[PDB]
Amino acid sequence: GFPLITITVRGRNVHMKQEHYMYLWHVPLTFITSKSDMVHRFLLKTKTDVLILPEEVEWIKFNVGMNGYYIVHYEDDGWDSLTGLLKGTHTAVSSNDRASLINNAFQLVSIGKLSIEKALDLSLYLKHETEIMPVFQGLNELIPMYKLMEKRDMNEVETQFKAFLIRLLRDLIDKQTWTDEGSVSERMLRSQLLLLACVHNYQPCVQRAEGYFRKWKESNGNLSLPVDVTLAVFAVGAQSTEGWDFLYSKYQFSLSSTEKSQIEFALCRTQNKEKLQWLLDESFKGDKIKTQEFPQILTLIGRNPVGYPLAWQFLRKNWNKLVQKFELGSSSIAHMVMGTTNQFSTRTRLEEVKGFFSSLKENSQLRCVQQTIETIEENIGWMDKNFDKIRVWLQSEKLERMHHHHHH
After folding, report:
1. Which of 106, 219, 232, 405 is the Cys-Cys partner for 194 at CB 3.0 to 4.6 Å?
2. Taking a C-beta distance cutoff of 8 angstroms, is the pair 119, 111 a contact?
3. At a CB cut-off of 8 Å and minimum separation 6, what does 164 contact?
4. For the domain with range 75-408, which CATH number is right: 3.40.50.1000, 3.40.50.300, 1.20.120.140, 1.25.50.20?
5. Where are the strands (E) in 293-383, listed by range?
6. Are 289 and 297 in contact (CB under 8 A)?
7. From the CA atom positions of the chain, what is the Rg in Å?
8. CB 347 within 8 Å of CB 152
9. Which of 108, 164, 106, 111 is nearest to 137 (CA)?
10. Helix, strand or coil for residue 394?
11. What whole-number distance in Å separates Cα of residue 217 and Cα of residue 213?
């Protein structure tokens, strides 16, 4: 793994600890503070050391001058100080600094040094966030949590989780234009935001999506849709049979591969089980859809909240043919093993997976089988510890917005 730096503030005394998480080096640290101007530097040569600030401070923010991944942990007191800072003047640290805070808080939950409650409390600052990185870093931590819940019996918490997500980003979603203007960033922010809104059934997005789809479809796809809006439009269009079939017709006749890829995604997101089975059957066959696309499709259906048992079944039933087609040690096979199983989080699923792959003999030894089993094992541990916590944190924050003592 990687360097983990623990920062502890004791009045004007800053204590710094280094460890390699998962022995010692000269850690080049930088930091600013609520009093600071510029960036201060400190070379940490020992296990722990202390520097002295000229004045007590309200928050401190460290970086490590290195390429690659590391974590800075500030402990309960320091994580609250940074939380208050992000909720008060988030721009006091840079766009990349805020993505780091988000990433590190949540990874510190998997590690067990920060509670999920504190990390979720940090995530609430996002309601003021506007920059792509912290936003996408937010999505990168939070989505995996409900992907896990989608494969269990947790409909009530999952929907409360998803509405929490949409609430964080709702103002930013309402600000987007349904156009192609802006920088590379703004177009990508737009495009992924509108999609996310529609996947979670945020009505103003969904209904504007349905209107664009209808207009596109009535034109025989002759009207040009803005490109940044098309995944969202396609994804809602594909929710009905008429629109799915229409979209499937166009996939056939299209000579634009970014269209074909957009449509491919939209077709895989339907709730209709017979369509999902068809996509798998036809892509596997290789004539209506290229078999080249099959590992991608299997994976996308593996992630559909309703297609996930079809994907793991299909992989198990057709294994000998999938191997003939793609080859045992291929990246295609590893991608497929991982995308149909790495979001399971129960012992039963784990025994299923171990059962199936240990029953293959010299067809069992693949490293992707060990790596999915590891991740499932982490999933089990993370969900058993955190699900009840998240459940109570969500109901308790929905209650507090209705009434809280600050309302007096």
Report:
1. 232
2. no
3. 394, 397
4. 1.25.50.20
5. none
6. yes
7. 24
8. no
9. 106
10. helix
11. 6
